[PDB]
Design a protein around this nucleic acid. Structure first.
Ligand SMILES: Nc1nc2c(ncn2[C@@H]2O[C@H](COP(=O)(O)OP(=O)(O)OP(=O)(O)O)[C@@H](O)[C@H]2O)c(=O)[nH]1
Ligand SMILES: [Mg+2]
Ligand SMILES: [Mg+2]
Ligand SMILES: [Zn+2]
Lengths: 19, 101, 168
RNA sequence: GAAGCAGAAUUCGGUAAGCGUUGGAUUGUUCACCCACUAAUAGGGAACGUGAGCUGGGUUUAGACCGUCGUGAGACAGGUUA
RNA sequence: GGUAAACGGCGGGAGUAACUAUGACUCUCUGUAGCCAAAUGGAUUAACGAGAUUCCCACUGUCCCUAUCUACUAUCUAGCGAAACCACAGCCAAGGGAACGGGCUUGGCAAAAUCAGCGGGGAAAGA
RNA sequence: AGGGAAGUCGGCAAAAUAGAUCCGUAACUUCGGGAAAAGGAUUGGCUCUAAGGGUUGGUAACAACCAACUUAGAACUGGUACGGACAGGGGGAAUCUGACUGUCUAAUUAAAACAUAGCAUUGCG
RNA sequence: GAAGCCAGAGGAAACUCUGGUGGAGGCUCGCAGCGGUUCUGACGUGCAAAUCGAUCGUCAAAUCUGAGCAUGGGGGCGAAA
């Protein structure tokens, strides 16, 4: 499989995630 | 203009009567009956703005005071001043009366 | 590619994609191909038939319609929250709003809809209807349409929610 | 007519087609299963042993796109629209 | 020999005894909202559309369940006046091995001349 | 009449909305739009009031003369109607799709088809 | 209701806000015109070898149109059917 590298994944910037 | 004029005379489009408006003005209990008949959350402006003379709810105080300067409100006021038609008036028109001993 | 090497004796391998409706099977196939080869829509049940897409010489991808295994412990509320059904064709969508409010944190909903101060779900729907102009004749709130909008935003990734992993 | 068939509701069987056998939801689909009213919501033929009443799907002239195969004209495991 | 490396093939990463292409022979590989990037991390793209699809309010004869009114025809009269189609004719039942009868056989029957409608059948689709 | 899609493959068709003034108008967004978004109040007639101008003439901030259409307010009054005929958006939540404006199969297909601007490549002194 | 322009309130200035003016857009509603989306439409030996009614798209331009001319089938022309 290889090493799981999720460090460079940018999550979706939703409206509810913004202060 | 009147919305959906061809079906204005249907029973499901009926409006409140002038004599019932007279009882609502004279006694607050009858008006309380008419208010508890409906559901408050489905009313314009949560039922806070109500014209008894026109028997109509309004969305805001500015809408209500805009209604009061209109001619339908003045027609309702003139009809209220003239006097609604009742069964007592209908009985006096033929000269009948009620004898209770 | 590793599976193809392991089955180098065969002429090719077939990789079929299965799962629930609206999990992204056709989206995964399109991403792997680098081209919109399978139809993609946020509504459940967009893929109705099985479809072959030739990824490489020895790799085929098989798109399949979504399946829901029948369980006696599954609720229609649970199916609607997992995205089985289209919310336009359900009766009284306001009953599923408490489930959405339980699943989604309150502050996330507040920052999503710029709304605060509701005491229950029907109050939240009425306030959001009055805020967004979802009004019927007489200015009454359209809690049905508001509930459908909230459910669609919950399904299509417009409201943040996830299930936390169990601790070891 | 029979049965532990006490009554009530029945179950099995017989004669009988005189008379009834409904209203709906669901097409991400072999449209078949659900819901209720009711006395009950029984099954078939006269088409489907090819075949001009009307209208939807098998169903498919010419326009067009996606998937598979082909070097290509194009054909199809196919899916959509008029 | 170098590539548009286009098409295309290619599971990685290490070594070496080969020593250059092809190597080959072993080893093993599985934050209930962050970090980083010059406000954003997008294609879940706004407007626009006689494009295709589902739903909500209002609305109504779409329906329950049909009724009524008007004009123009259809009807009758005067005048005027074709065409399509036509082997011959037009009531059915059963039989008529070739799964077909209108005419044959056996039965039921069977009464001039007509008018307005109807679409079972024969006819009728530049079929 | 009553019910209001129970009809139908499918709200097909019909109905409903519609002019003008005022209050008010969300998501999304290329910040331009969406938008007439959505949702509400009113509209007749009569009698009035007020405001909006021109020419000539030695604080002229004054006199004389002349003229037209708009705007706002008030009272009265008829009503089953008041854009009284005519004329005249139903609205909304979304999905797929093509950027749009535009073009074609005259006589069955106006469209995810063609073209378009933008982008990229090749040849030529 | 785009630039450009005027006035006021600010801001050290650069700029910001308000109220006007202005009349641009292969913008928009819509009459004519051009076109042809829909109707279990009319019509089906029709008024017509493609017409009629309602509805619809567009309507200041990649809009519509007359005359003269050029391109002639192994071709031309083609926003490509
Ligand atoms: N944010 C996000 N959305 C995704 C992702 N993958 C798929 N989606 C969305 O999920 C939706 C549903 O997936 P689909 O492409 O329809 O595939 P599916 O799961 O087979 O759905 P059905 O065809 O209906 O069975 C798509 O419309 C995508 O927009 C993802 O990785 N991230
Ligand atoms: Mg889907
Ligand atoms: Mg799919
Ligand atoms: Zn009043």
């Amino acid at each position: 499989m290889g090493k799981t590298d999720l460090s460079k994944l940018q999550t979706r910037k939703m409206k509810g995630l913004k202060r | 203009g009147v919305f959906a004029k061809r079906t204005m005379t249907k029973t499901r489009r009926r409006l409140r009567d002038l004599d019932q408006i007279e009882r609502d003005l004279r006694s607050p209990r009858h008006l309380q009956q008419y208010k508890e008949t409906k559901a408050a959350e489905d009313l314009p402006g949560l039922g806070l703005y109500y014209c008894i003379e026109c028997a109509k709810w309004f969305e805001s105080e500015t809408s209500l005071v805009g209604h009061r300067k209109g001619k339908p409100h003045k027609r309702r006021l003139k009809q209220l001043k003239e006097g609604a038609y009742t069964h007592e008036e209908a009985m006096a028109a033929i000269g009948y009366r009620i004898d209770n001993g | 590619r590793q599976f193809s090497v392991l089955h180098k004796d065969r002429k090719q391998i077939s990789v079929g994609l299965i799962g629930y409706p609206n999990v992204g099977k056709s989206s995964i196939i399109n991403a792997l191909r680098g081209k919109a080869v399978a139809k993609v829509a946020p509504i459940p049940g967009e893929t109705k038939v099985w479809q072959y897409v030739t990824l490489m010489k020895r790799i085929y991808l098989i798109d399949c319609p979504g399946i829901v295994p029948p369980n006696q412990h599954d609720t229609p509320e649970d199916l609607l929250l997992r995205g089985v059904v289209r919310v336009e064709n359900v009766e009284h969508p306001e009953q599923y709003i408490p489930a959405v409010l339980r699943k989604v944190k309150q502050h996330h909903m507040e920052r999503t809809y710029e709304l605060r101060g509701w005491k229950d779900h029907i109050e939240f729907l009425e306030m959001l209807a009055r805020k967004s102009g979802r009004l019927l004749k007489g200015g009454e709130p359209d809690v049905d349409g508001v509930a459908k909008q909230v459910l669609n935003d919950f399904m299509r990734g417009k409201i943040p929610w996830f299930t936390p992993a169990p601790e070891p």
